[PDB]
Design an enzyme around this catalytic site. Structure first.
Site, PDB file in Angstrom:
ATOM      1  N   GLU A   1     -64.035 -14.811  12.451  1.00 52.57           N
ATOM      2  CA  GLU A   1     -63.689 -14.738  13.864  1.00 52.57           C
ATOM      3  C   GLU A   1     -62.181 -14.825  14.003  1.00 52.57           C
ATOM      4  O   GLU A   1     -61.513 -15.635  13.331  1.00 52.57           O
ATOM      5  CB  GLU A   1     -64.263 -15.878  14.692  1.00 52.57           C
ATOM      6  CG  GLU A   1     -65.780 -15.913  14.733  1.00 52.57           C
ATOM      7  CD  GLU A   1     -66.338 -17.021  15.612  1.00 52.57           C
ATOM      8  OE1 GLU A   1     -65.607 -17.637  16.426  1.00 52.57           O
ATOM      9  OE2 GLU A   1     -67.543 -17.292  15.501  1.00 52.57           O
TER      10      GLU A   1
ATOM     11  N   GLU B   1     -68.785 -22.249  11.507  1.00 54.47           N
ATOM     12  CA  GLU B   1     -67.912 -23.383  11.851  1.00 54.47           C
ATOM     13  C   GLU B   1     -68.524 -24.771  11.637  1.00 54.47           C
ATOM     14  O   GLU B   1     -68.685 -25.543  12.574  1.00 54.47           O
ATOM     15  CB  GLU B   1     -67.394 -23.238  13.298  1.00 54.47           C
ATOM     16  CG  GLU B   1     -66.551 -21.982  13.456  1.00 54.47           C
ATOM     17  CD  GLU B   1     -65.837 -21.878  14.791  1.00 54.47           C
ATOM     18  OE1 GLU B   1     -65.996 -22.776  15.626  1.00 54.47           O
ATOM     19  OE2 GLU B   1     -65.133 -20.871  15.004  1.00 54.47           O
TER      20      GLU B   1
HETATM   21  O1  LIG Z   1     -61.752 -22.280  16.153  1.00 52.03           O
HETATM   22  C1  LIG Z   1     -62.768 -22.027  17.121  1.00 52.03           C
HETATM   23  C2  LIG Z   1     -63.484 -23.319  17.501  1.00 52.03           C
HETATM   24  O2  LIG Z   1     -62.499 -24.262  17.946  1.00 52.03           O
HETATM   25  C3  LIG Z   1     -63.085 -25.522  18.292  1.00 52.03           C
HETATM   26  O3  LIG Z   1     -62.064 -26.401  18.713  1.00 52.03           O
HETATM   27  C4  LIG Z   1     -61.438 -27.171  17.688  1.00 52.03           C
HETATM   28  C5  LIG Z   1     -60.284 -26.403  17.024  1.00 52.03           C
HETATM   29  O4  LIG Z   1     -60.752 -25.329  16.198  1.00 52.03           O
HETATM   30  C6  LIG Z   1     -59.476 -27.345  16.151  1.00 52.03           C
HETATM   31  O5  LIG Z   1     -58.350 -26.645  15.614  1.00 52.03           O
HETATM   32  C7  LIG Z   1     -59.038 -28.574  16.959  1.00 52.03           C
HETATM   33  O6  LIG Z   1     -58.318 -29.487  16.124  1.00 52.03           O
HETATM   34  O7  LIG Z   1     -60.181 -29.249  17.489  1.00 52.03           O
HETATM   35  C8  LIG Z   1     -60.970 -28.449  18.375  1.00 52.03           C
HETATM   36  C9  LIG Z   1     -62.167 -29.278  18.848  1.00 52.03           C
HETATM   37  O8  LIG Z   1     -61.721 -30.320  19.727  1.00 52.03           O
HETATM   38  C10 LIG Z   1     -64.067 -25.369  19.447  1.00 52.03           C
HETATM   39  O9  LIG Z   1     -64.634 -26.642  19.777  1.00 52.03           O
HETATM   40  C11 LIG Z   1     -65.156 -24.379  19.067  1.00 52.03           C
HETATM   41  O10 LIG Z   1     -65.992 -24.140  20.201  1.00 52.03           O
HETATM   42  C12 LIG Z   1     -64.551 -23.063  18.579  1.00 52.03           C
HETATM   43  O11 LIG Z   1     -65.620 -22.224  18.098  1.00 52.03           O
END
Ligand SMILES: OC[C@H]1O[C@@H](O[C@H]2[C@H](O)[C@@H](O)[C@H](O)O[C@@H]2CO)[C@H](O)[C@@H](O)[C@@H]1O
Ligand SMILES: OC[C@H]1O[C@@H](O[C@H]2[C@H](O)[C@@H](O)[C@H](O)O[C@@H]2CO)[C@H](O)[C@@H](O)[C@@H]1O
Length: 313
Positions: free
Chosen positions: A247, A135
């Site tokens: 994932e 990520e």
């Molecule tokens: O997808 C898993 C991942 O998500 C993270 O949050 C993100 C999200 O994916 C995104 O779609 C959105 O726009 O923003 C948030 C962050 O604020 C999360 O922070 C991770 O821990 C997680 O692994």
């Protein structure tokens, strides 16, 4: 399984990531050998293994930590013994000790050096798959693509022919793969990647809660998973590439179970481009109330979502 690789993340080596080096069995753990055999018995031929860059390489551009490498090799022995593939997932969010790749503190070349060294260790091994970075975020799609290209190049320079899983930025979300709201999309940026070894797949993640973070045990509809995979799937096809769902997870409720069946069925129907998937997560250090655990109980019993995962394995 109609897909080549199906399985689970065995989470635990990436825990308490602020702690460097941290202490084995206190701050983090590697999986039990019995974890590998349990999932093999459910039909799963692939394990994704999160671990920390900081723990395997305590100084940027420096030698690998031999104890940490030994732990990885021990997990590899277990995977091979159970006829599984092992994805080495550098579980780092495009950071090292809290600093982003591309800053002066952490040049993109440092990631290429890490992967050079791991490739030298594991090149002669058909069971090992290289998961470049968990990520990436906080870095533009073109800058991340540059970092990724350097890493692929570094791996191939060693002679390693192993499968490489390449993520995008924006937490490598399938749903946002083509988004241009904030600039260049992952789709556009990653079009220019070249793998002289011709053995690459694009890793996306997908959660089904409101912001696709997997923060909440809600799937926003019974069809949202498959829907969010469509743009990415088409991109793979357009570019003659393959994909891997590194994932994904759904909570234990009827709407989520329907969404889970839908997304697993969707990937099977589109197996020309989907190479596989790994569920988030198993491992011995989740609490009982963790909504996405498929770690078997102390009593040996299967977790609710495993009954569905096993059907597709
Ligand atoms: O997808 C898993 C991942 O998500 C993270 O949050 C993100 C999200 O994916 C995104 O779609 C959105 O726009 O923003 C948030 C962050 O604020 C999360 O922070 C991770 O821990 C997680 O692994
Ligand atoms: O609080 C339990 C444990 O969480 C660990 O992070 C988890 C997180 O809870 C989960 O939401 C996310 O999807 O996965 C990460 C692990 O990669 C954390 O590392 C530990 O410090 C903490 O004890």
């Amino acid at each position: 399984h109609m897909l080549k690789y199906v399985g689970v993340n065995l989470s635990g080596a990436e825990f308490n990531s602020r702690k460097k080096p941290g202490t084995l069995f206190k701050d983090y753990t590697y999986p039990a050998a019995s974890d590998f055999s349990y999932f093999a018995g459910k039909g799963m031929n692939t394990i994704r293994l999160p671990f920390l860059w900081e723990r395997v390489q305590p100084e940027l551009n420096g030698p690998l930590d031999q104890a940490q490498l030994g732990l990885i090799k021990k997990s590899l022995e277990a995977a091979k013994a159970n006829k599984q593939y092992l994805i080495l997932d550098l579980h780092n969010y495009a950071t090292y000790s809290g600093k982003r790749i591309g800053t002066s503190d952490v040049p993109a070349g440092a990631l290429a050096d890490l992967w050079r060294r791991l490739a030298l260790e594991f090149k002669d091994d058909k069971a090992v798959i290289f998961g470049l970075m968990n990520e990436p975020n906080g870095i533009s799609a073109p800058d991340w693509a540059n970092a990724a290209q350097g890493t692929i190049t570094a791996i191939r320079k060693t002679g390693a022919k192993n499968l490489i899983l390449v993520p995008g930025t924006a937490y490598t979300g399938a749903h946002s793969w083509r988004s241009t709201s904030y600039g260049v999309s992952n789709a556009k940026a990653l079009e220019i990647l070249k793998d002289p070894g011709n053995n690459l797949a694009f890793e996306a993640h997908q959660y089904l809660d409101k912001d696709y973070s997997g923060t909440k045990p809600v799937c926003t509809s019974d069809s949202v998973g498959q829907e969010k995979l469509q743009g990415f799937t088409s991109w793979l096809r357009e570019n003659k590439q393959k994909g891997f769902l590194g994932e994904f997870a759904t909570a234990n409720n009827p709407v989520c179970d329907k969404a889970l069946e839908g997304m697993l069925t969707y990937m099977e129907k589109n197996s020309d481009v989907w190479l596989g998937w790994t569920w988030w997560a198993a491992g011995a250090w989740w609490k009982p109330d963790y909504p996405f655990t498929v770690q078997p109980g102390k009593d040996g019993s299967d977790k609710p979502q495993m009954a569905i995962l096993s059907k597709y394995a």
